[PDB]
Design a protein around this ligand. Sequence first.
Ligand SMILES: CCCCNC(=O)N1CCN(C(=O)c2ccco2)CC1
Length: 119
Amino acid sequence: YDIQAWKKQCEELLNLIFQCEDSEPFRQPVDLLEYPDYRDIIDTPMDFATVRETLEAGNYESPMELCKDVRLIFSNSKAYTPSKRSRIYSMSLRLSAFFEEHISSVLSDYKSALRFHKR
Ligand SMILES: CCCCNC(=O)N1CCN(C(=O)c2ccco2)CC1
């Protein structure tokens, strides 16, 4: 029932994600010079370095907020993909499945801890 345990759990999961080859395209913001129409399609850029920095700054209150930003990385890739068969989109779907498999217990444990706190 540790209300703070999510933060280190999220740091560890981000470490795993940075070790995954599938995260390569999502470790920094999209350079417009490679993809000059990116901001015509994507309203809110997001990447794993921005997520880690936000976490390490103490600017997430809950793992739900972190989860919303990570899911934005994946929705941006689905919105920007010219094909569902894209290399970089296919990497996003595998990384998304890995992230969802690992974040589920982090969320469950946090929400259980908060319910216990307010019991
Ligand atoms: C790590 C910094 C530079 C790598 N980032 C980058 O240029 N990417 C990632 C996001 N992109 C897509 O999700 C996508 C879908 C289909 C094609 O690209 C655009 C290309």
